[PDB]
């Protein structure tokens with residue numbers, strides 16, 4: 104019931120006690136592990152609020168104090184009266200940083216405390232959402248010296264007035280089905296691109312067309328906005344040794360910014376909460392460029408390298424994969440856009456994990472997501488046992504809005 | 511109940527009903543997932559249900575469920591348990607059980623081959639010398655001059671747990687490791703402790719970088735005995751690179767036959783504490799883990815030097831670059847010497863086909879994603895995108911404590 108995790112490369116063992124605060128369910132049971140599955144009233148609210156407020160006032164060394172008891176009473180009053188309640192700015196900031204701290208699938212959590220929280224709970228229209236998101240983008244991009252940030256829109260009330268960003272990320276490229284049968288652009292985004300065209304977007308039908316924002320305020324129908332082109336920092340991808348690489352026409356955007364998750368704090372739900380940091384190189388070069396269901400350029404790069412593509416055992420896919428990922432890091436570094444390589448990021452996560460066990464009693468971590476999608480065992484996270492459990496505050500998945508929105 | 515798994519690359523959705531037949535526990539709870547934890551005397555009381563379950567499975571597979579032969583066998587095993595507190599498997603049941611233990615091995619990517627396992631029955635063995643002879647014949651048969659063949663040798667089952675047969679080696683063929691006084695290691699750092707045991711037991715160590723360890727063999731609970739595998743039975747492959755002629759000068763070689771010898775085979779409640787089994791290598795087991803783990807031979811630095819890669823910052827991906835070239839050399843060398851080996855692309859594509867086949871005809875295929883995904887180039891292999899369900903069926907291979915921690919010494 105108190106748990107050990109071993110690192111099999113260094114022989115270090117850590118003792119996890121933080122998991123005994125787990126509040127949500129994992130999807131696993133004693134008979135079956137689901138660790139690789141991508142997606143496994145007033146009475147409910149006050150215990151949720153009490154538990155968050157208890158950890159908040161414990162974190163500020165004011166547990167059981169007058170201010171603690173007074174807030175507890177005031178929140179209790181507000182829930183009986185107004186069915187819900189509002190977070191103080193300090194609680195909102197704490198709740199947001201801790202949601203990131205608790206994100207077991209995130210390798211970049213060594214940075215969790217330096218998050219810039221933008222309170223957008225005064226937003227009332229989709230036009231306001233767009234201004235708040237443009238400012239987020241500009242602040243976070245910061246001319247390429249990227250800064251972590253989240254923008255928090257008004258909390259769910261009765262579920263019929265949700266704020267939602269319909270895009271999965273603030274910045275993504277469109278995908279179009281060709282009459283051909285092939286796919287132009289990002290195949291991950293074909294459906295959402297269809298909804299943009301359905302809502303009236305004029306698609307350039309290019310290969311790297313930054314999608315528009317589809318913003319929903321107060322449960323209203325979503326509206327379309329285009330991020331100002333000069334706020335979208337992009338990087339042309341070249342290779343430090345292959346002059347021909349630039350001829351592939353590849354570029355990627357600088358800012359990874361997740362916009363479709365749900366932030367839970369003290370039982371309150373923030374259905375629109377875009378957050379951003381900076382890329383790990385392999386997110387672009389391994390997944391975006393080489394997934395079969397994405398831009399899928401492995402074959403092309405390998406042909407320009409003149410590799411023996413007859414047999415898998417020449418490892419031509421592996422060789423091209425390394426080169427694509429060399430180019431991605433070289434291009435971002437050359438253009439002075441913040442990026443981290445998977446060796447640096449995983450080494451940082453180990454230091455962070457040690458810090459969390461030492462100062463917090465544990466660190467929930469999902470090995471399937473923490474280990475990078477290339478060169479797994481030469482990063483130190485590969486040899487690190489990890490316990491996965493669900494702490495709150497938390498980022499959570501939510502249904503795509505077009506499947507739930509009454510139009 | 512029905513459970514579904516999605517492949518996120520192809521959108522194939524499969525439905526698992528086989529998990530309903532799972533008895534053993536996983537280590538996970540509704541509140542914690544232990545999916546990345548490495549490792550998370552039996553009275554007549556529980557033995558007969560375990561026998562009855564295995565025998566029902568066996569007679570179902572041969573389409574004889576409920577037959578007179580089935581009912582007689584159950585009656586026979588029942589009486590043998592109440593009389594003798596244990597029972598003996600027929601040869602057919604032992605073969606079936608060992609194949610299915612492999613079939614159920616959720617961490618094994620090679621399971622497409624599970625039905626082509628050569629089972630060597632060594633249940634008549636009584637001494638360590640006899641174990642040695644059986645193991646030599648396994649190595650010779652399985653090596654097959656480089657045309658490798660899967661095999662398992664099964665020694666007598668546990669009785670009171672005071673007379674266990676055990677192979678003390680973790681693998682039949684492994685290289686020694688020697689801790690130097692200066693802290694460095696010569697040979698395989700993984701095997702330092704076992705090497706010391708061998709030396710303590712009287713092994714005269716050559717003290718080179720690639721010394722094949724002796725077998726340390728325990729029969730009927732007696733103290734273990736040292737035996738040197740005949741070197742002509744130990745097929746080895748010198749590692750060279752198809753384009754880099756300096757690679758041969760690194761002096762690397764590996765053995766051809768991977769053979770796990772420290773696991774326990776459970777069949778119908780019987781425990782076979784000595785059951786070495788062997789197949790052939792996936793390239794990355796040698797080129798990624800054995801050569802490039804920091805806790806193993808750890809040659810990335812040297813190889814990257816010889817390629818004169820920019821090593822001053824990890825952002826050059828020099829580690830990734832040298833990793834691919836080492837794994838190219840390992841596959842090139844085994845293929846050149848006509849020793850069986852599979853690359854991780856071929857191996858994972860085959861496992862996907864096997865798993866889909868298993869879903870259709872068996873209703874499930876337990877799989878441990880953490881172990882199935884190769885240790886390099888994970889997402890350009892089709893298992894990366896494949897959701898998997900991990901659960902424990904019997905017959906099964908289980909871990910067991912190392913014998914030097916449990917063995918009662920005689921002297």
Ligand code: HEM
Nearest residue numbers: 203206208209210211214251252378379380381382383498
């Ligand atoms: C600052 C640099 C950051 C880096 C290098 C980083 C890295 C990553 C990576 C590699 C993943 C795996 C996701 C995938 O492969 O698709 C991930 C997931 C995630 N990150 Fe971080 N991240 C950063 C910042 C942040 C921030 C600022 C937040 C929230 C405030 C955050 C929250 C999350 C969450 C919730 C997930 C899991 C998403 C899911 O389950 O789909 N990350 N991160």
Ligand code: HEM
Nearest residue numbers: 612615617618619620623660662787788789790791792907
């Ligand atoms: C025929 C070719 C085979 C291939 C290519 C293969 C491949 C693999 C690989 C790559 C692993 C992970 C090993 C590690 O990372 O340490 C593994 C594990 C395993 N294999 Fe296979 N294997 C083969 C044959 C067999 C056979 C014949 C058996 C048993 C009869 C078997 C049973 C297992 C088991 C039980 C594990 C789990 C080991 C553990 O939990 O530590 N495999 N296999």
Ligand SMILES: Cc1cc(N)nc(CCc2cc(F)cc(CC[C@@H]3C[C@H](F)CN3)c2)c1
Nearest residue numbers: 141359360361378379380381382383386518
């Ligand atoms: C802030 C941030 C920083 C960073 N450095 N990186 C990311 C990307 C993390 C991420 C989060 C998600 F919520 C979803 C994705 C991609 C969704 C796909 C859908 C597939 F099914 C598998 N994942 C990526 C975000």
Ligand SMILES: Cc1cc(N)nc(CCc2cc(F)cc(CC[C@@H]3C[C@H](F)CN3)c2)c1
Nearest residue numbers: 620680768769770787788789790791792795
């Ligand atoms: C039959 C077979 C074929 C193949 N192609 N490959 C293997 C390797 C499987 C294996 C199982 C083990 F039980 C242990 C190892 C190596 C020991 C390390 C040390 C740690 F304990 C973790 N495993 C390898 C086996």
Ligand SMILES: C[C@H](O)[C@H](O)[C@H]1CNc2nc(N)[nH]c(=O)c2N1
Nearest residue numbers: 485486487488546547548880881
């Ligand atoms: C901690 C972690 O489970 C450990 O490093 C595992 C990860 N996956 C693995 N996968 C394979 N095939 N072999 C291994 O030894 C391991 N080690």
Ligand SMILES: C[C@H](O)[C@H](O)[C@H]1CNc2nc(N)[nH]c(=O)c2N1
Nearest residue numbers: 139140141471472894895896897
């Ligand atoms: C099936 C499997 O869960 C799926 O491919 C996961 C594996 N690990 C991952 N890891 C990260 N970081 N991101 C991902 O999208 C995935 N996808």
Ligand SMILES: [Zn+2]
Nearest residue numbers: 131136538543
């Ligand atoms: Zn689990």
